[PDB]
Scaffold this active site. Structure first.
Site, PDB file in Angstrom:
ATOM      1  N   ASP B  70       8.071  -0.581  10.412  1.00 62.91           N
ATOM      2  CA  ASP B  70       6.631  -0.254  10.100  1.00 62.91           C
ATOM      3  C   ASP B  70       5.864  -1.160  11.996  1.00 62.91           C
ATOM      4  O   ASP B  70       4.462  -0.418  12.004  1.00 62.91           O
ATOM      5  CB  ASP B  70       6.167  -1.578   9.467  1.00 62.91           C
ATOM      6  N   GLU B 197      -4.815  -4.773   3.932  1.00 62.73           N
ATOM      7  CA  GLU B 197      -5.251  -3.477   3.541  1.00 62.73           C
ATOM      8  C   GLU B 197      -6.520  -3.176   3.216  1.00 62.73           C
ATOM      9  O   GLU B 197      -5.986  -2.520   1.939  1.00 62.73           O
ATOM     10  CB  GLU B 197      -4.536  -2.756   3.336  1.00 62.73           C
ATOM     11  N   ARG B 212      -5.094  -5.532  -1.748  1.00 60.15           N
ATOM     12  CA  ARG B 212      -3.692  -5.258  -2.085  1.00 60.15           C
ATOM     13  C   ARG B 212      -3.165  -6.832  -1.711  1.00 60.15           C
ATOM     14  O   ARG B 212      -3.842  -8.303  -0.645  1.00 60.15           O
ATOM     15  CB  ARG B 212      -2.677  -4.614  -1.500  1.00 60.15           C
ATOM     16  N   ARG B 290       6.167   4.607  -5.305  1.00 52.66           N
ATOM     17  CA  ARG B 290       4.715   4.964  -5.342  1.00 52.66           C
ATOM     18  C   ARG B 290       4.806   6.372  -5.516  1.00 52.66           C
ATOM     19  O   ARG B 290       5.303   7.654  -5.021  1.00 52.66           O
ATOM     20  CB  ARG B 290       4.712   5.242  -3.751  1.00 52.66           C
ATOM     21  N   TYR B 324       0.028   5.150   0.128  1.00 57.64           N
ATOM     22  CA  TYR B 324      -1.023   4.257   0.342  1.00 57.64           C
ATOM     23  C   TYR B 324      -2.525   5.599  -0.102  1.00 57.64           C
ATOM     24  O   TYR B 324      -2.408   7.159  -0.328  1.00 57.64           O
ATOM     25  CB  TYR B 324      -1.431   4.269   1.373  1.00 57.64           C
TER      26      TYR B 324
HETATM   27  C1  SIA Z   1       1.400  -4.666   9.732  1.00 55.14           C
HETATM   28  C2  SIA Z   1       2.565  -4.574   8.585  1.00 55.14           C
HETATM   29  O1  SIA Z   1       3.981  -4.378   9.217  1.00 55.14           O
HETATM   30  N1  SIA Z   1       1.823  -3.209   7.338  1.00 55.14           N
HETATM   31  C3  SIA Z   1       3.224  -3.389   6.809  1.00 55.14           C
HETATM   32  C4  SIA Z   1       2.626  -3.485   5.255  1.00 55.14           C
HETATM   33  C5  SIA Z   1       3.169  -4.901   5.218  1.00 55.14           C
HETATM   34  O2  SIA Z   1       4.347  -4.848   4.819  1.00 55.14           O
HETATM   35  C6  SIA Z   1       2.813  -4.999   3.753  1.00 55.14           C
HETATM   36  O3  SIA Z   1       1.265  -5.575   3.350  1.00 55.14           O
HETATM   37  C7  SIA Z   1       3.482  -7.238   3.507  1.00 55.14           C
HETATM   38  O4  SIA Z   1       2.434  -7.379   4.447  1.00 55.14           O
HETATM   39  O5  SIA Z   1       3.480  -2.299   4.276  1.00 55.14           O
HETATM   40  C8  SIA Z   1       4.065  -1.510   4.360  1.00 55.14           C
HETATM   41  O6  SIA Z   1       5.683  -2.230   4.786  1.00 55.14           O
HETATM   42  C9  SIA Z   1       4.363  -0.853   3.032  1.00 55.14           C
HETATM   43  O7  SIA Z   1       4.154  -1.520   1.778  1.00 55.14           O
HETATM   44  O8  SIA Z   1       4.604   0.507   2.865  1.00 55.14           O
HETATM   45  C10 SIA Z   1       3.593  -0.588   5.515  1.00 55.14           C
HETATM   46  C11 SIA Z   1       2.861  -1.701   6.739  1.00 55.14           C
HETATM   47  O9  SIA Z   1       3.730  -0.755   7.799  1.00 55.14           O
END
Ligand code: SIA
Ligand SMILES: *[C@@H]1O[C@H](CO)[C@@H](O[C@@H]2O[C@H](CO)[C@@H](O[C@@H]3O[C@H](CO[C@H]4O[C@H](CO[C@H]5O[C@H](CO)[C@@H](O)[C@H](O)[C@@H]5O)[C@@H](O)[C@H](O[C@H]5O[C@H](CO)[C@@H](O)[C@H](O)[C@@H]5O)[C@@H]4O)[C@@H](O)[C@H](O[C@H]4O[C@H](CO)[C@@H](O)[C@H](O)[C@@H]4O[C@H]4O[C@H](CO)[C@@H](O)[C@H](O)[C@@H]4O[C@H]4O[C@H](CO)[C@@H](O)[C@H](O)[C@@H]4O)[C@@H]3O)[C@H](O)[C@H]2NC(C)=O)[C@H](O)[C@H]1NC(C)=O
Ligand SMILES: *[C@@H]1O[C@H](CO)[C@@H](O[C@@H]2O[C@H](CO)[C@@H](O[C@@H]3O[C@H](CO[C@H]4O[C@H](CO[C@H]5O[C@H](CO)[C@@H](O)[C@H](O)[C@@H]5O)[C@@H](O)[C@H](O[C@H]5O[C@H](CO)[C@@H](O)[C@H](O)[C@@H]5O)[C@@H]4O)[C@@H](O)[C@H](O[C@H]4O[C@H](CO)[C@@H](O)[C@H](O)[C@@H]4O[C@H]4O[C@H](CO)[C@@H](O)[C@H](O)[C@@H]4O[C@H]4O[C@H](CO)[C@@H](O)[C@H](O)[C@@H]4O)[C@@H]3O)[C@H](O)[C@H]2NC(C)=O)[C@H](O)[C@H]1NC(C)=O
Ligand SMILES: *[C@@H]1O[C@H](CO)[C@@H](O[C@@H]2O[C@H](CO)[C@@H](O[C@@H]3O[C@H](CO[C@H]4O[C@H](CO[C@H]5O[C@H](CO)[C@@H](O)[C@H](O)[C@@H]5O)[C@@H](O)[C@H](O[C@H]5O[C@H](CO)[C@@H](O)[C@H](O)[C@@H]5O)[C@@H]4O)[C@@H](O)[C@H](O[C@H]4O[C@H](CO)[C@@H](O)[C@H](O)[C@@H]4O[C@H]4O[C@H](CO)[C@@H](O)[C@H](O)[C@@H]4O[C@H]4O[C@H](CO)[C@@H](O)[C@H](O)[C@@H]4O)[C@@H]3O)[C@H](O)[C@H]2NC(C)=O)[C@H](O)[C@H]1NC(C)=O
Ligand SMILES: *[C@@H]1O[C@H](CO)[C@@H](O[C@@H]2O[C@H](CO)[C@@H](O[C@@H]3O[C@H](CO[C@H]4O[C@H](CO[C@H]5O[C@H](CO)[C@@H](O)[C@H](O)[C@@H]5O)[C@@H](O)[C@H](O[C@H]5O[C@H](CO)[C@@H](O)[C@H](O)[C@@H]5O)[C@@H]4O)[C@@H](O)[C@H](O[C@H]4O[C@H](CO)[C@@H](O)[C@H](O)[C@@H]4O[C@H]4O[C@H](CO)[C@@H](O)[C@H](O)[C@@H]4O[C@H]4O[C@H](CO)[C@@H](O)[C@H](O)[C@@H]4O)[C@@H]3O)[C@H](O)[C@H]2NC(C)=O)[C@H](O)[C@H]1NC(C)=O
Ligand code: SIA
Ligand code: SIA
Ligand code: CA
Ligand code: CA
Ligand code: CA
Ligand code: CA
Ligand code: CA
Lengths: 388, 388, 388, 388
Positions: B70, B197, B212, B290, B324
């Site tokens: 991510d 989010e 969420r 998902r 998403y």
């Molecule tokens: C800033 C960041 O890392 N955001 C990531 C979030 C967080 O990990 C969750 O909200 C837990 O806080 O979730 C994802 O991994 C996901 O579920 O696909 C994608 C996204 O990139």
């Protein structure tokens, strides 16, 4: 509209935030990205763009072989949208050549490209995308310029050129252009002994350029220009925090009017923002090569020969390749002060990574924040192994 | 021209019609398409565009390996023409970072990107394509934001951020920006126990965000913001029709002020339109992953803890991958009401499809119709086997 | 500015000159060209562009396999610059769907796309690049439309749709839109027994559409619309010069109010300009397949059941593949009359060229000349062998 | 705005500086570059662009095989941004055909393309991007035109065409267009015995064209046009410095009113600036093939049959391939005089480099300087071996 005037002072630099990054080498591994070097950033009143000297070939193209060379008939100054990579399809050619500078005066942009053989180069000054003036080589030895943006004030845009030796005294000139025409030129004066690739910025009707003494200095020469009187002075950054590369290790006392010795005939384009206590210096972390990059707050670096850092920010880890760095600011932003910005050229390929036959780079750039922001390191990000 | 004001109520949602689809993964199998994730859609007064966090590499490029992660220094918020794929050549970089939001206030657009290491991230707020404000991490644990458009009213554009734990109580803040500058910020208040989010929309001078609860809730938290008073409240959607993922099976009675238990430390960005009987909820079909996507009309879902569906529309079959989903509306369209719209991220590759080393997605989006339209399913459409 | 009004009559057609040609298949053999079909041409007041239904994949891409199918969730109406090929990077998506029409009313453009399963399709009418109206299938059997530009007069833009059987009587409707909203609709009336894919043009406040009787007719049905009264009539082209395909050989006497028999349940989109002695008919040369293309001057074809050609022009040799053809004119050109234009879809690949797994096309288009110009043939130009 | 009038005289030509270079073949080795030939440069009031006849295929594409041929249905006049290469994605089609010219009159641009079989070609004159006039072949033998920009004065834009033999007397005509319509045409008059591919420029209400006598002359024919009276004269450049190719070696005395003999039925498009002592001639260095390129100052070349060079500048080394060359000027630049410019087509591939199956080129162009600039040579730069 009207010519821009340097009416503001710099904003207080408490840290640096991420401004742009194109990840050119990563992306170019599988897309039509032009091989480049000597990049920079420059703003128009309505847009800020990336600039660089293309090598006239894509990175994956067979013609990428040999791009370690600096001057050929296939180079050109190109610009493209902020943080996009320089691709064959989105790059705009500003002029043809192997050394350049460019700046917007508030009404329109002036771009300058130098081309030719080593002993017979010439500069052509473009304004409003048309050729207006030409200047022939005066010392018949690689006429060359900034490799970063120039700065304008009320229509006058000074530009520093050097013609002659890279390892001995040379003929540096400060040209004052207005609408692409020469108003006046002076020979370099002051105590700077050798000048190359000046990185400049403007504030409160004064233009400050931090250059490269390729011949003898590990401390950087500085040229301060008055764009109204069309006069200037030169000296070196007094500080013992040495910022050229390669360089000796930092001493406890620097030199204000002579090159600090220890390393000859080599260097790298660099920059600084000299503003009393609000002074920051950029430099490679390595004293041996274009490796790593950091910003150091050195209050009064320009005038204090014992000045040492009071704060800092790592931009690129010493385990990653860096390269050239220079200054630019968005003179058309809102607010009461000019936000200092800079870019770092992240060179990939030759000579440090010889498994590939090419040499290119990507760009990372930051601007100052009045907040004290957390830091991250920003490497090029490509895996050479993928190109093999 | 003038700042847009949320003067209209939502149009009656009787069904959903196809609005945009880029078929990015299909096309990208043989063209220079950037690897992305966390996409969304956002409108300017004269154009609606697709947005997403690029991974700084094409899908076919060797650097696509590892894109399941991510946060890296190679990500950036990019936008591109509606229904086109995000290509190297048509993508516009809004800012650099691994978490974002963006919205137009009627005069110009504000984009926000957060970058940094996990313990030292920072947000930079861009307005009119220039950096204006920076906010340092306050809990030193992955400062993060919406991943979908924010909403403005008379120049004020609220944005929800969270810093701290993803599996325990965290520090969520609602920032009220105007021209990229902070007017005010509040800590989260109300009964929502964990926020991440937020998907938001505005109608009749009120902004509704469906978020969420990653820590404990399978029902979704909701934040209602008054952009004039610059205050807010929070609760959960009362309805037993659970909409996070993974989740337990639907009960007969939901929870209005506590997370509905059954699944911890996981979730997916989602949304809803809460408007009395004109209420629709989006959710994955699968309670495990998902997978699939559907819209359910659940009259009074927000306030009725026994509310069940009265109508529905399948968007993506449970035999296809989703991801998403978030809200957006064209606040500059003609007519007397705002037409509710949403997008669904169709994730391909890792972790569900591990034969490839990358993770990306394509986008599908719909908007409401007052007609009762026939339905079709809208899968990504690419064959993984082709990428092997 | 103001809505365009059909105030001029057609220019005298003495021959046809080359207007545009994109060589899409040739170019696409080694560049990112989208697979398409059902193309057409349409003008805005300041630009004329190519349009077509993309298949959501490039020709060289692995997803090109299977593109012989007409309706999928990966199709979309796209437009691109005149005579350029439809590439991933220059194509603009107008709407999502597998059947379409589009026309500019002088102020802005209306685009219509139909999507869905066979028994539950729906049309969404876009105006000024926003969705405005939606129409659900009325006969639950492949709701479909023109596949070429509609025509407007004082804001009213009539469009012909058909829902139901392709091999028996169906439910055709003429919708009169203004700013994307429905002013009125009528069921088809007159003697045309089956209507599909109408090719239309306007002159002197009247809109003429030459369509396809898929069920029984080898002569073409014609719908004349009064966009002011919002009424219409229908009949067939009386002429024995038959213009659908496949078809029987030309007789000596045609049929004015019934399909001319000989071939059932098949056809091809085509067109004509019916203007007394200034009448020209387009048709494939082959009576068996979409092979070759020619224009024939048949004075009074519409009303004379014994009319035969008085002049002609070959567009595509019978040794080359053709396909759909339709009408368009630049209603915003200078002069005292409207210059009749048309395009021919040059289909390549399946079913006629089965060595490749895909089906696509390129476009050629001409406009009339008052001169008697020399003729050339205009084939697609690609070598299938190259794609193997 | 208003039609441009040729009010200025030429600037003094003391040398030539680099203006544009696209490195098309180099770049195209690994990017989607269209195969071209017969390029030129032409300016609008706000932009200068490259033009050429595309072959409707990329260089790396399999359809590049056979591109040595001049006339096919896959050619088109395309333009693209100055110094960019002609790519599939940035090329704009002006019209369809295998021979062309184009020029801006100050208000809008006129483009002309000729297409057809050898015995039935026709020209279509486009104005403001719309077809306006068509001219049928008059001698039924390859109707052809300039292959470089035309020039306008007060709306009148003369264009030279030739129809008939390339190896005997032919029918050349001077057409005077205004807004794409024919005001008048004349047959060639004067002493020029054969005219092809005129290179033109304008100064002080006079248009000068340097053409190609394919039949007998190694000296170049010259047509001087009065765009107000709409009359002209023709002769040859008197100078013994012969400028067509192939050619005999230079004599000591040239010919003013007859072709200088020695070489029949062959030649190359070329140009000159005839302005008394300020006269410069371009020519290939080789007298045998399109090899090398140089500019020679030959005071009074047009009228002095013994004139020899007084200064010179090498543009392309005789060890590099050249090709066509023509004139253009930016009539909308600032200043008191028109700066003479020219381009040289650098042909690569067949027939001289037969290891590849294609024929294409790249472009280099220069403009005059009042300075006496140092010179460099400007080759195409691509390695054929890379394409094997
Ligand atoms: C800033 C960041 O890392 N955001 C990531 C979030 C967080 O990990 C969750 O909200 C837990 O806080 O979730 C994802 O991994 C996901 O579920 O696909 C994608 C996204 O990139
Ligand atoms: C989250 O993000 C934040 C924000 O980025 C992170 O915090 C940042 O952390 C970095 C890294 O630690 C800091 O950078 C360094 O800054 C120091 C300067 O700060 C120190 O010194 C100050 C000055 O002290 C003297 O003067 C003062 C003033 O009068 C006086 O008070 C004092 O007593 C003394 O007399 C101190 O003020 C300052 O204190 C404040 O901050 C502390 C934290 O920083 C805090 O603990 C204190 O309580 C107080 O609040 C602090 O002590 C720089 O000196 C340093 O740069 C040197 O070091 C790096 C390697 O780290 C090196 O690469 C640099 O080149 C440089 O060292 C070389 O050059 C020197 C000069 O010649 C030389 O002396 C050295 O030997 C060394 O030379 C060698 O290397 C070079 C280069 O290779 C070579 O050329 C030579 O030849 C030779 O080989 C760093 O820049 C940031 O300032 C800090 N930012 C902020 C806002 O806090 C935070 O860590 C992140 N969080 C997490 C969890 O990761
Ligand atoms: C052409 O296109 C059109 C337009 O799309 C197609 O028609 C559409 O067809 C779809 C699919 O059938 C419909 O979607 C479903 O809608 C129903 C809701 O409608 C029914 O229930 C209404 C409410 O009834 C109760 O209240 C009313 C009101 O007071 C009362 O009157 C009634 O007596 C009763 O007391 C009825 O009003 C409604 O009737 C009307 O419409 C009928 C047709 O729809 C018609 O026959 C009638 O005459 C009348 O006109 C109708 O009976 C949703 O309930 C349903 O959603 C559930 O089912 C899907 C699977 O299908 C599931 O994925 C959903 O999640 C949901 O079920 C889960 O959640 C529930 C809530 O917790 C739970 O109870 C279920 O057990 C189930 O839970 C499990 O799965 C989930 C998800 O995996 C999991 O999380 C749980 O843990 C658990 O495992 C659909 O959305 C459209 O509404 C309809 N649209 C229109 C305009 O008609 C048409 O079919 C197409 N044509 C062709 C030829 O294909
Ligand atoms: C340079 O460029 C120029 C410009 O393009 C080239 O010149 C062009 O040449 C083409 C090809 O020759 C011409 O096209 C054909 O036109 C004729 C029509 O013209 C003839 O007939 C006219 C009408 O005659 C009757 O009425 C008149 C009027 O009252 C009366 O005067 C006359 O006595 C008679 O009673 C004549 O006016 C006309 O004369 C003028 O022009 C002559 C030259 O064209 C000149 O010599 C004369 O002196 C005079 O000046 C002329 O005689 C079309 O009929 C023809 O179309 C048929 O033929 C093609 C095959 O060629 C076919 O594909 C068509 O479909 C069509 O034939 C089918 O359909 C018919 C109708 O049902 C049927 O009867 C046929 O049996 C045939 O049917 C079969 O095939 C079809 C299709 O496959 C199938 O569906 C059926 O089932 C069946 O199997 C051509 O269109 C251009 O008009 C001409 N243009 C110009 C401006 O001149 C020039 O050649 C080029 N130069 C070079 C060197 O190459
Ligand atoms: C840095 O950059 C600068 C700027 O570019 C470089 O300097 C340039 O250098 C080039 C190359 O040397 C020069 O180009 C040549 O120019 C000469 C013309 O100049 C000479 O002649 C002048 C005229 O003289 C006669 O008249 C004058 C006037 O009345 C009278 O004074 C004189 O006494 C005599 O009666 C002289 O004025 C001129 O003098 C000035 O300049 C000198 C330096 O140039 C300087 O030393 C002097 O002190 C004074 O200041 C000078 O003497 C051209 O003639 C020449 O072109 C011919 O040669 C090339 C090969 O080099 C050839 O390709 C051309 O086609 C041409 O020769 C062919 O055609 C002729 C005509 O028919 C024929 O006679 C020849 O036999 C030959 O024919 C053969 O080849 C052709 C082509 O293949 C074929 O078709 C035939 O069949 C046959 O096979 C060059 O253009 C630049 O002018 C000069 N520029 C400047 C501003 O100085 C500098 O060198 C660079 N620096 C470095 C370190 O590299
Ligand atoms: C015009 C020119 O050749 N500039 C080159 C300069 C000069 O060689 C030095 O400044 C010595 O003068 O430095 C480089 O080689 C370098 O260090 O990477 C790059 C650049 O292209
Ligand atoms: C909506 C739709 O499916 N249109 C298809 C129509 C219909 O099948 C026929 O008109 C019979 O109704 O014809 C085609 O197959 C064809 O002949 O090439 C192409 C087109 O895509
Ligand atoms: Ca490629
Ligand atoms: Ca140095
Ligand atoms: Ca959860
Ligand atoms: Ca039929
Ligand atoms: Ca000749």
């Amino acid at each position: 509209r009207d010519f821009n005037n340097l009416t503001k002072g710099l904003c207080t630099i408490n840290s640096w935030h991420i401004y742009g990054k194109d990840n050119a080498v990563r992306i170019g591994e599988d897309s039509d990205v032009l091989v480049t070097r000597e990049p920079y950033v420059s703003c128009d009143p309505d847009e800020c763009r990336f600039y660089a000297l293309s090598q006239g070939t894509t990175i994956r193209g067979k013609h990428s072989n040999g791009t370690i060379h600096d001057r050929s008939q296939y180079r050109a100054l190109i610009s493209w949208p902020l943080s996009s990579p320089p691709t064959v399809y989105n790059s705009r050619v500003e002029c043809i050549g192997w050394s350049s500078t460019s700046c917007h005066d508030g009404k329109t942009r002036m771009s300058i490209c130098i081309s030719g053989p080593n002993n017979n180069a010439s500069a052509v000054i473009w304004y409003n995308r048309r050729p207006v003036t030409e200047i022939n080589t005066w010392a018949r030895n690689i006429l060359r310029t900034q490799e970063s943006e120039c700065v304008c004030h009320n229509g006058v845009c000074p530009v520093v050129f050097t013609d002659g030796s890279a390892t001995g005294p040379a003929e540096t000139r400060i040209y004052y252009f207005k609408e692409g025409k020469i108003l006046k030129w002076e020979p370099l004066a002051g105590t700077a002994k050798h000048i190359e690739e000046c990185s400049c910025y403007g504030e409160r009707a004064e233009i400050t350029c931090t250059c490269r003494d390729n011949w003898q200095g590990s401390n950087r020469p500085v040229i301060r220009i008055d764009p109204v009187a069309m006069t200037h002075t030169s000296q070196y950054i007094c500080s013992p925090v040495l910022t050229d590369n390669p360089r000796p290790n930092d001493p406890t006392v620097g030199k204000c009017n002579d090159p600090y010795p220890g390393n000859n005939n080599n260097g790298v384009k660099g920059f600084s923002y000299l503003d009393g206590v609000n002074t920051w210096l950029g430099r490679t972390i390595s004293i041996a090569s274009r490796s790593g990059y950091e910003m150091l707050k050195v209050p009064n670096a320009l005038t204090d020969d014992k000045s040492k850092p009071t704060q800092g920010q790592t931009i690129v880890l010493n385990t990653d390749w860096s390269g050239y760095s220079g200054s630019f600011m968005d003179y058309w932003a809102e607010g009461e002060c000019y936000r200092a910005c800079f870019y770092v050229e992240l060179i990939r390929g030759r000579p440090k990574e010889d498994k590939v036959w090419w040499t290119s780079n990507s760009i990372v750039s930051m601007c100052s924040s009045t907040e004290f922001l957390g830091q991250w390191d920003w490497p090029d990000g490509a895996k050479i192994e993928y190109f093999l």
